[PDB]
Amino acid sequence: SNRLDGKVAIITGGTLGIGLAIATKFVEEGAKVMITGRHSDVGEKAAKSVGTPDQIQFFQHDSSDEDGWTKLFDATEKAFGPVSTLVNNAGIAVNKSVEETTTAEWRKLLAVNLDGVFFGTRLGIQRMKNKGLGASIINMSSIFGFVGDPSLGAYNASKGAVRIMSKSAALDCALKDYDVRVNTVHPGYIKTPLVDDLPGAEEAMSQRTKTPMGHIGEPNDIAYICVYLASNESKFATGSEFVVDGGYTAQ
Amino acid sequence: SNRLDGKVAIITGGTLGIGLAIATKFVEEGAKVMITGRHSDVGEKAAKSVGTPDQIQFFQHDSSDEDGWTKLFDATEKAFGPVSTLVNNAGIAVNKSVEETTTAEWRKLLAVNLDGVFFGTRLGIQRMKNKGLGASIINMSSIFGFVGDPSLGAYNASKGAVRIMSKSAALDCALKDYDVRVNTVHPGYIKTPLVDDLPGAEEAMSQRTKTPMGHIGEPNDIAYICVYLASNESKFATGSEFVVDGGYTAQ
Amino acid sequence: SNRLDGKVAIITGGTLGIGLAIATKFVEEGAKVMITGRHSDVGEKAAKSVGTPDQIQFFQHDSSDEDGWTKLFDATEKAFGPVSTLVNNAGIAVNKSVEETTTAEWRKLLAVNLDGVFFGTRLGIQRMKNKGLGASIINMSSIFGFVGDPSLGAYNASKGAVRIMSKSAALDCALKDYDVRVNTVHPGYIKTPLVDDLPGAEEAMSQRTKTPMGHIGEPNDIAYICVYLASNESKFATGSEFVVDGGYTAQ
Amino acid sequence: SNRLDGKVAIITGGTLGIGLAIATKFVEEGAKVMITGRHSDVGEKAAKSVGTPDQIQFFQHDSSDEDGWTKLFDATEKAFGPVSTLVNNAGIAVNKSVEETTTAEWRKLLAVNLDGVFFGTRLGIQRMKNKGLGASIINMSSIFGFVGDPSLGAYNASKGAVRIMSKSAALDCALKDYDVRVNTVHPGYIKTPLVDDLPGAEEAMSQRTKTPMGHIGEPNDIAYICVYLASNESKFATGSEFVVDGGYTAQ
Numbered sequence A, B, C, D: 001s002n003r004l005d006g007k008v009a010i011i012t013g014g015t016l017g018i019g020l021a022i023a024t025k026f027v028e029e030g031a032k033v034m035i036t037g038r039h040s041d042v043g044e045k046a047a048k049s050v051g052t053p054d055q056i057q058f059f060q061h062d063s064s065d066e067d068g069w070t071k072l073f074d075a076t077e078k079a080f081g082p083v084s085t086l087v088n089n090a091g092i093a094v095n096k097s098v099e100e101t102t103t104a105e106w107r108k109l110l111a112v113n114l115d116g117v118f119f120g121t122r123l124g125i126q127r128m129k130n131k132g133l134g135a136s137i138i139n140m141s142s143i144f145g146f147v148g149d150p151s152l153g154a155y156n157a158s159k160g161a162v163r164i165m166s167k168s169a170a171l172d173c174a175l176k177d178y179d180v181r182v183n184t185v186h187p188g189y190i191k192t193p194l195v196d197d198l199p200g201a202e203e204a205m206s207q208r209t210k211t212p213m214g215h216i217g218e219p220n221d222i223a224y225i226c227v228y229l230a231s232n233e234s235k236f237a238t239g240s241e242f243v244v245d246g247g248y249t250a251q
């Protein structure tokens, strides 16, 4: 227990699914947490379901909103003190091949999945460097930052960008002794509310030709690797990709 | 010889350096070539230096210009017939860490390096599929689509995006029997005019801790792998990354 | 705490350095542990330094010894009950290029680093499958399972073999619902007794051109990722590579 | 044409299938070739089918035979002059999971696929370095040097070892200015005599969940990438992996 003692974390898209599980385990391990999402109804209920305002609060923010990122860090500092930990988890998907992606779809997805992660990573470095916080930026990528999917063209682009941009940030932070690590987490298929709302999705994701374990994961599978990466347990890990995918990318 | 017999190729950024070498070898192997760039002075001289208008022409185009991509394919079809081959080579770099990248720099680089490659790949699939051309899309990435560089944050993002987006397109084209392959080429450091204009750059790039061969490459090093990928010699290669880097990524 | 409640672990080469740290943290998290090594003087002192015989014991064994692997699993079962967890950590290095490796050096290194990991993985699957133990095989690889080093030819061969052989085992175990996961851990440079016995080694390993963090790691850096992989926290992770290297492979 | 002018090549396992196609294209591009295999009936017919003894000869040799490697290089030098090019292509497969691999199977496969490639690579460096030959060692790996297959445990081990050992050799040769490059080729499924002798194999290999192109390749697909790597066209490529797999590893 207390694996995140003293840590102050921002988790984008932390009001449902994977992000909510990360927030729940972060609080359980002693972190103070600010979760974000676009809808305040979901967000305020999510925060209250996890802990008191002394442990966890909600901040309404679209991760594509550059100016809002400043307000998000400001509000987290005011509530909890200097931010030590950022999980860039908010993301969207378009079910389109590259061939069939409209430019509006392309720009919308990249605004959230790529611009948003860049805005959070850039600001995180500027706010967390040189403070002795054992700071950690955890950028959510995907198995689809490693392998293509024919119907996830823009998603693939964004997750490949997050994968390699994070290595750049890791190196710069390491070479400059900033006390900031940057790593990526790559979930396979995980049982989320979106998955349960798509008839047949889970069965398709569980075929052995997709997930060799024959079933999909659960949100706490991603929460636990994020606890390790936020914790000083992982103080020598930077610039690395952490895959939790039921074997998807091993075949 | 005649390794590209009958092929019709568009090469973006084909008026100098690597792109010009690709265009030169493509013409030598029997392809008809349309090269692009932003400046007509450079472009018309480059075309004339390689061959006659029956072999190679110039089309003025910024690869970030979505509507211009349609006009580029139209003009190439009018000159040479249906396009079989696209080399998405135009790209720019910003010498900034993620931390120090302005949003204007971020958007400018991504417009050329990511949006431009998406526009060309998407249009290429739509124009080249199902025509029996043995079509090939060659997306220029970089060693910096594999590894970070602390001073190339936005570049890293764009080249990681190109790397994985290209796998998505490769899979969709393969699964749908489009007769279009998509692969990425990843140059290491190559002696180009930009390199020769930066005092000390080549020596820095040639340190054994960067390039184990102790020297950088030349534009024809990238031309030759592009000839292989454009040719029916590589008819079973799709979704793959081809690295020509003097050992940079092997250590 | 109790992150390894009920687990029974074998750690090869667990009497010094990284393996001893893994064993120490495993016991702290509630596992029962059998550590191995070739020298009983080191091994019995190591076990006693960590806990009582009810928590941790030593078994003298060279990991290249195929028949001894059976006796090792037998003795662990007798002391602690069915084995749930195997860390294949024992390994040796030869400071030779491929060109300068003698065949005797080649065979000696592969006997420990490759045959030994195969013997333990094969036996582990046979002993741990279908017992509801949440079983986990953690194969120690290296950054040198990803990148070459000109003076580690045989080592590179063995660590690349361990990396991909482990994916085969992961897939078979997943597809057959064996309740056995297989993953690899890839340390960068870690401060060990061998390192401290080589004058100048740590400084060389800490150059930014090798480790961007500017220093090497410590044994607990590898212990903590092994706790995560042995624990049911990582029940959806199989067939994956976990790198803890101070940024070495990110550039 | 003449892409291998003046080159002198050894191709192991060059008497059937992929190795024979490599030998055929090498001769077509002007190389002198010594092919090997265990059976002289196959080997002498293969050589005669490709060219005259002035172009191509056969040498009977099991690639696991260390002393025979010396005799093989000696005989090639005597026939054709100093060897510039080595394709380590001979290899075998066992259809067994790690769990079900006998130690005899393990040692037999590794003797050919790993020891043999080490013996040829080590000797090749010693014989080809510092002679101004533009020397190239092409080590045949596999898609199964990248991803696991549950029924190819020992094969996976050997191909992962070849993949990373080759990077070590590439780096040492580059750093020491030996004028020797080392790269790996990774075929997907290819229509060979062994494949045609297994009922149902090709259909299984052609399922979209295995090969997205929906069919397997042919031996000339691997010959053409080997011509590029043997040729001075690839003089800046070393330490790299070249995949020709119909999309297998892209998903």
Ligand SMILES: NC(=O)c1ccc[n+]([C@@H]2O[C@H](COP(=O)([O-])OP(=O)(O)OC[C@H]3O[C@@H](n4cnc5c(N)ncnc54)[C@H](OP(=O)(O)O)[C@@H]3O)[C@@H](O)[C@H]2O)c1
Pocket: A012, A013, A014, A015, A016, A017, A019, A036, A037, A038, A039, A042, A061, A062, A063, A064, A089, A090, A091, A092, A093, A094, A095, A112, A192, A193, A194, A197, A198
């Ligand atoms: N037939 C259909 O139309 C259909 C059916 C089922 C599912 N879907 C999928 O549903 C998706 C939309 O669902 P969703 O995005 O609300 O998923 P979600 O599962 O709610 O997203 C997970 C988390 O990310 C947050 N989040 C999402 N976008 C964010 C942003 N820009 N900035 C910050 N946090 C963000 C969410 O909170 P907030 O949402 O409150 O921001 C939530 O906390 C569509 O893109 C579509 O693929 C479509």
Ligand SMILES: NC(=O)c1ccc[n+]([C@@H]2O[C@H](COP(=O)([O-])OP(=O)(O)OC[C@H]3O[C@@H](n4cnc5c(N)ncnc54)[C@H](OP(=O)(O)O)[C@@H]3O)[C@@H](O)[C@H]2O)c1
Pocket: B012, B013, B014, B015, B016, B017, B019, B036, B037, B038, B039, B042, B061, B062, B063, B064, B089, B090, B091, B092, B093, B094, B095, B112, B192, B193, B194, B197, B198
């Ligand atoms: N101190 C300095 O300011 C300094 C000094 C030296 C170098 N530099 C670098 O020089 C860079 C600009 O040089 P450059 O881009 O002209 O390089 P370049 O070497 O000319 O670019 C190579 C090729 O790509 C083409 N190209 C470039 N951008 C393109 C686009 N958007 N669409 C299509 N083709 C394109 C070029 O033609 P066109 O250029 O005609 O389009 C040319 O054919 C700066 O980004 C900077 O990093 C700066």
Ligand SMILES: NC(=O)c1ccc[n+]([C@@H]2O[C@H](COP(=O)([O-])OP(=O)(O)OC[C@H]3O[C@@H](n4cnc5c(N)ncnc54)[C@H](OP(=O)(O)O)[C@@H]3O)[C@@H](O)[C@H]2O)c1
Pocket: C012, C013, C014, C015, C016, C017, C019, C036, C037, C038, C039, C042, C061, C062, C063, C064, C089, C090, C091, C092, C093, C094, C095, C112, C192, C193, C194, C197, C198
């Ligand atoms: N100039 C020199 O000669 C010099 C100087 C300094 C270091 N070295 C290096 O020292 C190395 C030998 O040291 P070491 O192997 O004893 O290292 P070590 O640091 O003791 O090895 C770490 C752990 O692995 C165990 N282990 C080693 N080989 C094993 C095996 N085959 N089976 C099971 N467990 C095994 C060790 O216990 P056990 O050792 O008790 O088995 C120990 O628990 C040489 O290979 C050399 O590279 C050489």
Ligand SMILES: NC(=O)c1ccc[n+]([C@@H]2O[C@H](COP(=O)([O-])OP(=O)(O)OC[C@H]3O[C@@H](n4cnc5c(N)ncnc54)[C@H](OP(=O)(O)O)[C@@H]3O)[C@@H](O)[C@H]2O)c1
Pocket: D012, D013, D014, D015, D016, D017, D019, D036, D037, D038, D039, D042, D061, D062, D063, D064, D089, D090, D091, D092, D093, D094, D095, D112, D192, D193, D194, D197, D198
């Ligand atoms: N039911 C069955 O038993 C069955 C049925 C069909 C196929 N098979 C498979 O057939 C395999 C044996 O076929 P094969 O190895 O002869 O295949 P192959 O297709 O003949 O091998 C390709 C090339 O490699 C050469 N080669 C093979 N081993 C070599 C070595 N150790 N050193 C040098 N060159 C070597 C071969 O010549 P040489 O062979 O003349 O050396 C040939 O030139 C078995 O391992 C099995 O998987 C088995």
Ligand SMILES: [Mg+2]
Pocket: none
């Ligand atoms: Mg929502």
Ligand SMILES: [Mg+2]
Pocket: A147, A248, A249, A250, A251, D147, D248, D249, D250, D251
């Ligand atoms: Mg795959």
Ligand SMILES: [Mg+2]
Pocket: none
């Ligand atoms: Mg210019």
Ligand SMILES: [Mg+2]
Pocket: none
């Ligand atoms: Mg010792």
Ligand SMILES: [Mg+2]
Pocket: B147, B248, B249, B250, B251, C147, C248, C249, C250, C251
């Ligand atoms: Mg590197």
Ligand SMILES: [Mg+2]
Pocket: none
């Ligand atoms: Mg045979």
